[PDB]
Amino acid sequence: NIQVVVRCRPFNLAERKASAHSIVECDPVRKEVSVRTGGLADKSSRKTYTFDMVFGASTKQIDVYRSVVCPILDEVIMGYNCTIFAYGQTGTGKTFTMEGERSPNEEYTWEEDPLAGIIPRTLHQIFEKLTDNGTEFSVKVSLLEIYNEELFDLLNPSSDVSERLQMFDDPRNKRGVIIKGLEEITVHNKDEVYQILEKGAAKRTTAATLMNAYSSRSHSVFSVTIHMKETTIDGEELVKIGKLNLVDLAGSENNQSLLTLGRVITALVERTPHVPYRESKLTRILQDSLGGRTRTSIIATISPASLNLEETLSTLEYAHRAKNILNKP
Amino acid sequence: KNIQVVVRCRPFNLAERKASAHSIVECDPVRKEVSVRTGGLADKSSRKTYTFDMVFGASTKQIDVYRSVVCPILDEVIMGYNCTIFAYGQTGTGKTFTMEGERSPNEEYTWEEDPLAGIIPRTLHQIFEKLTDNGTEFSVKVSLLEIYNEELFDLLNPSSDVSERLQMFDDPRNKRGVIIKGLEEITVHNKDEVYQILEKGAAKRTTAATLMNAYSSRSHSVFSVTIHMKEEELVKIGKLNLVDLAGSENNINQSLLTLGRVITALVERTPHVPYRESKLTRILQDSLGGRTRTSIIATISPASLNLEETLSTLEYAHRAKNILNKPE
Amino acid sequence: KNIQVVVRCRPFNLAERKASAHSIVECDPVRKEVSVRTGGLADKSSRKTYTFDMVFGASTKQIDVYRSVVCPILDEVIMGYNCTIFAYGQTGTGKTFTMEGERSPNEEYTWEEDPLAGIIPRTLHQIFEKLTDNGTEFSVKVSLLEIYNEELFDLLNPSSDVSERLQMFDDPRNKRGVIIKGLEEITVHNKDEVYQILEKGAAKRTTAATLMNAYSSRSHSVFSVTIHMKEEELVKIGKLNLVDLAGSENNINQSLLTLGRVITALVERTPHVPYRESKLTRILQDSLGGRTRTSIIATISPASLNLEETLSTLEYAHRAKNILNKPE
Numbered sequence: 006n007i008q009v010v011v012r013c014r015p016f017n018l019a020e021r022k023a024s025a026h027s028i029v030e031c032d033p034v035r036k037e038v039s040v041r042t043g044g045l046a047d048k049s050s051r052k053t054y055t056f057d058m059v060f061g062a063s064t065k066q067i068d069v070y071r072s073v074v075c076p077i078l079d080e081v082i083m084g085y086n087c088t089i090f091a092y093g094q095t096g097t098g099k100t101f102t103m104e105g106e107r108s109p110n111e112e113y114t115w116e117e118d119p120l121a122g123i124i125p126r127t128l129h130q131i132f133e134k135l136t137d138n139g140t141e142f143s144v145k146v147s148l149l150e151i152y153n154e155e156l157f158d159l160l161n162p163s164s165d166v167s168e169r170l171q172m173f174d175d176p177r178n179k180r181g182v183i184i185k186g187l188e189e190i191t192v193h194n195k196d197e198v199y200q201i202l203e204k205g206a207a208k209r210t211t212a213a214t215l216m217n218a219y220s221s222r223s224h225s226v227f228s229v230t231i232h233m234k235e236t237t238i239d240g241e242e243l244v245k246i247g248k249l250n251l252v253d254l255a256g257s258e259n260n261q262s263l264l265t266l267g268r269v270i271t272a273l274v275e276r277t278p279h280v281p282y283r284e285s286k287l288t289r290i291l292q293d294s295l296g297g298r299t300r301t302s303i304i305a306t307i308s309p310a311s312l313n314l315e316e317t318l319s320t321l322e323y324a325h326r327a328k329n330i331l332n333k334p
Numbered sequence: 335k336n337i338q339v340v341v342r343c344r345p346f347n348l349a350e351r352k353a354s355a356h357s358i359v360e361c362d363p364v365r366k367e368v369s370v371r372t373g374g375l376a377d378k379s380s381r382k383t384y385t386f387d388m389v390f391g392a393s394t395k396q397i398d399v400y401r402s403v404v405c406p407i408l409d410e411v412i413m414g415y416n417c418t419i420f421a422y423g424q425t426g427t428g429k430t431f432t433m434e435g436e437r438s439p440n441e442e443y444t445w446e447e448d449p450l451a452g453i454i455p456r457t458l459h460q461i462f463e464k465l466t467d468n469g470t471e472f473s474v475k476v477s478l479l480e481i482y483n484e485e486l487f488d489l490l491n492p493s494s495d496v497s498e499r500l501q502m503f504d505d506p507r508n509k510r511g512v513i514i515k516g517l518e519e520i521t522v523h524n525k526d527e528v529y530q531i532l533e534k535g536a537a538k539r540t541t542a543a544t545l546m547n548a549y550s551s552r553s554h555s556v557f558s559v560t561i562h563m564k565e566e567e568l569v570k571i572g573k574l575n576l577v578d579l580a581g582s583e584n585n586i587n588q589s590l591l592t593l594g595r596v597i598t599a600l601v602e603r604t605p606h607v608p609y610r611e612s613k614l615t616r617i618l619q620d621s622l623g624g625r626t627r628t629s630i631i632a633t634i635s636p637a638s639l640n641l642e643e644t645l646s647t648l649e650y651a652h653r654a655k656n657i658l659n660k661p662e
Numbered sequence: 663k664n665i666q667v668v669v670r671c672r673p674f675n676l677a678e679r680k681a682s683a684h685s686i687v688e689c690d691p692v693r694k695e696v697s698v699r700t701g702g703l704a705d706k707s708s709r710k711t712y713t714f715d716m717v718f719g720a721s722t723k724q725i726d727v728y729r730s731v732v733c734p735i736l737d738e739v740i741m742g743y744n745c746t747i748f749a750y751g752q753t754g755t756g757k758t759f760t761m762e763g764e765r766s767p768n769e770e771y772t773w774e775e776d777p778l779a780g781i782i783p784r785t786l787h788q789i790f791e792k793l794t795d796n797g798t799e800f801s802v803k804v805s806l807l808e809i810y811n812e813e814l815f816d817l818l819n820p821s822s823d824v825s826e827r828l829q830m831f832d833d834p835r836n837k838r839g840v841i842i843k844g845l846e847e848i849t850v851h852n853k854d855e856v857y858q859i860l861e862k863g864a865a866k867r868t869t870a871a872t873l874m875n876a877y878s879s880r881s882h883s884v885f886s887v888t889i890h891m892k893e894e895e896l897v898k899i900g901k902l903n904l905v906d907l908a909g910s911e912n913n914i915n916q917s918l919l920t921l922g923r924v925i926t927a928l929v930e931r932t933p934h935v936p937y938r939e940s941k942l943t944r945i946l947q948d949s950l951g952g953r954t955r956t957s958i959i960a961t962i963s964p965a966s967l968n969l970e971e972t973l974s975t976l977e978y979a980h981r982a983k984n985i986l987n988k989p990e
């Protein structure tokens with residue numbers, strides 16, 4: 006049982022300028038995406054899909070947060086391991102969703118910013134919810150990228166983003182791995198968040214000038230780990246450990262990690278006995294927070310442009326295979 | 335009746351001038367011959383020479399091409415046959431210049447008196463000149479589609495988004511023909527309607543290029559003009575296709591590739607000819623071994639840099655002389 | 663002999679410092695070792711260490727490279743051996759800088775005293791300096807060709823179009839040699855004639871880059887100096903080839919491709935070395951297993967980003983030390 010949602014972005018300047026026509030109709034209430042498929046030859050042809058949620062070009066970042074993350078974030082707190090992926094063609098709002106943007110000329114606080122995506126929102130809520138819940142807790146973040154199956158550490162104290170991590174099988178866990186060299190930062194409070202996210206962005210900006218099409222060919226794994234203490238009446242300590250992975254996948258257009266994931270998601274769906282985690286860096290990193298027993302969701306991002314027809318259809322067929330709902334009448 | 339093939343060599347462009355280019359191409363209009371100098375610094379004497387139905391050297395103007403090639407063909411179209419002219423050769427050699435032409439800067443001339451105007455505008459002008467006089471009742475429909483990455487686009491459509499796609503089907507009426515579903519055919523009521531249409535055409539293409547990669551040199555351009563003629567009651571229907579191919583130096587090359595294969599099958603006389611394997615060859619099926627009369631303008635550059643492509647375009651053009659058609 | 667192999671590491675460039683690059687390369691001139699840190703953030707102790715005939719760190723200047731590598735080689739050329747020095751490495755690591763160098767801006771220095779002059783300019787100076795002294799009668803001729811996409815171009819040709827191609831034939835009076843048909847070999851009567859000749863070759867090369875895709879990173883440069891010494895009463899001939907290979911990371915790459923297969927076969931004493939399968943390996947047949955005496959300058963960047971390509975340059979160069987030539 007994996008959750009699959011779809012988010013159509015609005016038109017960019019390039020599209021308005023080319024007088025783009027839309028071919029995507031999103032029905033929030035019916036949980037349906039509708040695609041106009043016959044160009045000039047057949048005006049009536051439609052292909053329709055159903056998801057667990059459908060957000061239009063209108064959907065505000067917070068609506069996405071509230072609908073997708075909270076119920077998931079709850080499970081993380083109950084001490085489980087969860088992943089949310091953003092998926093789709095380059096240019097369709099994966100990075101906008103997973104992490105959002107800064108409104109120009111410091112105009113709201115980072116946490117007030119209406120353009121902020123899932124990552125910065127999630128961090129804000131983790132403290133909010135746990136500072137006032139009462140118990141003792143710590144919060145650790147990591148951020149790494151995968152490019153041509155090599156691993157980079159965006160939060161590392163090393164000034165050269167190009168120093169590469171390594172990955173080993175975790176002996177204390179048969180579903181886990183150890184990322185040798187991975188920096189994890191203790192986030193002591195709400196007020197430590199931004200500077201961390203800023204240093205991470207600065208490194209990524211550098212990564213992109215060093216390697217070709219770094220932005221679209223790379224996977225971002227942002228990871229939060231929450232540690233939750235409680236003592237018993239006679240002094241013994243019961244730890245809960247929660248783990249959320251926020252994953253900004255490489256662009257889907259037509260990459261070992263990307264195809265491999267697809268097959269892992271299939272193997273989980275139609276329940277074929279061997280699921281091929283080992284095959285890619287990304288599915289090995291992720292394995293531990295996949296399999297069921299832990300909530301997984303997928304935000305599929307599409308474009309509304311006519312130009313992006315095939316790409317959009319392809320995204321949708323991919324999402325549909327991840328979870329197959331029949332259409333209502 | 336054999337495809338006629340002509341060769342047109344353009345003059346050097348500024349970039350060639352600036353790089354001090356040597357010509358390696360000699361045209362002899364009167365013997366109808368092109369001779370290419372193939373041996374660089376190594377062998378100053380070796381040449382490859384070819385004979386064609388006509389050869390146009392560097393200093394050939396737009397009007398010369400019109401009078402030698404297009405006039406005789408438009409008269410055949412006016413007598414109710416079908417004809418096709420296509421431009422073949424390397425990027426930058428003047429396929430577009432020959433097929434469409436250019437507007438001289440500063441509006442120095444009227445569109446129909448512009449000496450840079452190419453075959454499509456001259457032809458439209460002459461369909462009108464020639465038929466208003468002769469006195470018959472007639473109409474003229476035009477269409478314009480581009481093939482890019484095996485997808486069909488409609489330059490003249492009223493739709494504002496160039497990317498809306500056409501579809502292609504077998505004609506149940508004509509065993510070699512196709513139906514292009516959704517293709518706007520514009521009725522041209524007269525000469526003074528011509529320009530605006532072409533200009534909307536141009537602007538739509540300009541948008542296509544900003545949307546799609548290497549659109550200009552990777553796409554094929556199919557311009558069609560249907561003439562209905564009335565003259566008890568006797569009607570003739572003439573059709574003329576003006577095609578402007580992808581750059582010959584070249585999914586993405588499928589129509590060019592299939593064109594080549596279709597041509598070889600026709601010249602070697604292989605029993606089965608793969609027209610169906612590309613959108614371009616399905617559209618041209620009647621021009622290539624069917625009953626349309628066909629002419630090819632093979633364009634070439636005179637520069638030494640372009641030697642291998644020049645040879646390639648000449649060999650390819652020369653063998654296409656061997657294809658037999660058979661009008662009405 | 664064995665092919666001599668030396669390594670040159672360049673300093674950081676502007677982009678590397680902007681990016682805050684760390685070094686992963688430590689050169690030890692005394693031990694003749696190059697040591698690369700391969701563990702990144704994961705593993706601080708892993709290294710890969712290679713011993714060469716000579717190693718030049720980031721602070722090495724053109725003159726140091728010249729005294730240690732070329733002076734000895736030119737001494738041998740003067741006693742009439744054949745010699746080859748070629749530069750191998752990823753794009754941007756300093757092949758051209760080593761073989762040719764650059765001119766300092768604003769005419770601050772005579773070409774003879776330019777601290778940035780590479781091997782080619784300094785050899786030509788030194789050749790006259792040495793022989794003007796001995797008073798033995800001598801002549802010097804030069805030539806400079808480039809290979810791109812398996813085509814040959816002559817940068818010293820009097821022909822104004824750099825794209826007129828050369829061709830290549832077996833040498834009838836040498837089993838391992840070729841003759842380049844059309845190659846301008848220029849007699850250099852005195853040091854005062856050297857600079858204008860380089861200037862012209864450079865300008866012809868500037869034009870070539872504007873005419874062909876990635877011409878500078880995909881082409882091989884072959885500069886050849888021939889020295890005739892009238893001495894007994896005999897002619898002694900010394901040949902020096904200075905070769906600047908295309909980027910290692912790379913018909914477009916046929917010559918690099920065959921260069922690798924030729925090297926592999928020389929290391930595994932394989933029956934038939936495919937010298938004929940590219941223009942380059944045919945030009946270099948003597949220098950690769952033949953009677954010519956060969957040095958390879960492997961060029962590398964110090965930056966962590968370039969780890970994979972640096973190692974591969976080092977593996978590739980290192981193995982070429984096993985190969986042996988038998989000089990004159």
Ligand SMILES: N[C@@H](CSC(c1ccccc1)(c1ccccc1)c1ccc(Cl)cc1)C(=O)O
Pocket residue numbers: 100101104105106107108115116118120121122124125199202203205206209227
């Ligand atoms: N899409 C932007 C990030 S915006 C953003 C950021 C941008 C510039 C300076 C500091 C932070 C950001 C946007 C809104 C609220 C908080 C953070 C951010 C959010 C999450 C993460 Cl992983 C890293 C950075 C980019 O990658 O260029």
Ligand SMILES: N[C@@H](CSC(c1ccccc1)(c1ccccc1)c1ccc(Cl)cc1)C(=O)O
Pocket residue numbers: 430433434435436437445446448450451452454455529532533535536539557
């Ligand atoms: N060949 C140019 C357009 S020139 C041209 C044109 C250009 C700009 C505005 C209006 C017309 C043109 C040039 C000379 C005489 C008539 C038309 C034209 C000719 C044939 C056709 Cl299919 C479309 C346009 C292009 O590829 O964009």
Ligand SMILES: N[C@@H](CSC(c1ccccc1)(c1ccccc1)c1ccc(Cl)cc1)C(=O)O
Pocket residue numbers: 758759761762763764765773774776778779780782783806860861863864867885
């Ligand atoms: N990297 C430069 C060459 S530098 C150089 C040169 C540069 C510009 C004008 C004239 C010469 C050069 C540098 C220092 C001393 C003499 C020559 C040079 C050296 C060898 C040869 Cl084949 C040709 C030219 C280029 O090829 O563009």
Ligand SMILES: Nc1ncnc2c1ncn2[C@@H]1O[C@H](COP(=O)(O)OP(=O)(O)O)[C@@H](O)[C@H]1O
Pocket residue numbers: 013014015017062093094095096097098099100101102106306
């Ligand atoms: N829902 C949305 N609303 C407004 N702008 C969006 C939306 N989704 C994407 N964008 C814009 O489109 C551009 C590309 O989006 P991006 O997040 O880079 O997509 P991807 O990560 O898939 O490349 C960004 O500059 C962003 O502002």
Ligand SMILES: Nc1ncnc2c1ncn2[C@@H]1O[C@H](COP(=O)(O)OP(=O)(O)O)[C@@H](O)[C@H]1O
Pocket residue numbers: 343344345347392394423424425426427428429430431432436581633
């Ligand atoms: N016969 C010719 N006379 C003058 N200019 C020409 C001729 N043929 C081509 N040109 C010029 O060369 C350029 C390339 O021609 P073009 O028609 O665009 O080549 P292609 O369409 O085959 O890529 C244009 O700028 C055009 O003006």
Ligand SMILES: Nc1ncnc2c1ncn2[C@@H]1O[C@H](COP(=O)(O)OP(=O)(O)O)[C@@H](O)[C@H]1O
Pocket residue numbers: 671672673675722751752753754755756757758759760961
């Ligand atoms: N040893 C060196 N010392 C100083 N600068 C260098 C050195 N080697 C290379 N460079 C610089 O690196 C740049 C690229 O060098 P180049 O010789 O063009 O590389 P390649 O020919 O291997 O592609 C040049 O602009 C040059 O100034």
Ligand SMILES: [Cl-]
Pocket residue numbers: 347348349
């Ligand atoms: Cl021009």
Ligand SMILES: [Mg+2]
Pocket residue numbers: 095096099100220221
């Ligand atoms: Mg992105």
Ligand SMILES: [Mg+2]
Pocket residue numbers: 429430550551
């Ligand atoms: Mg064109």
Ligand SMILES: [Mg+2]
Pocket residue numbers: 757758878879
């Ligand atoms: Mg170079």
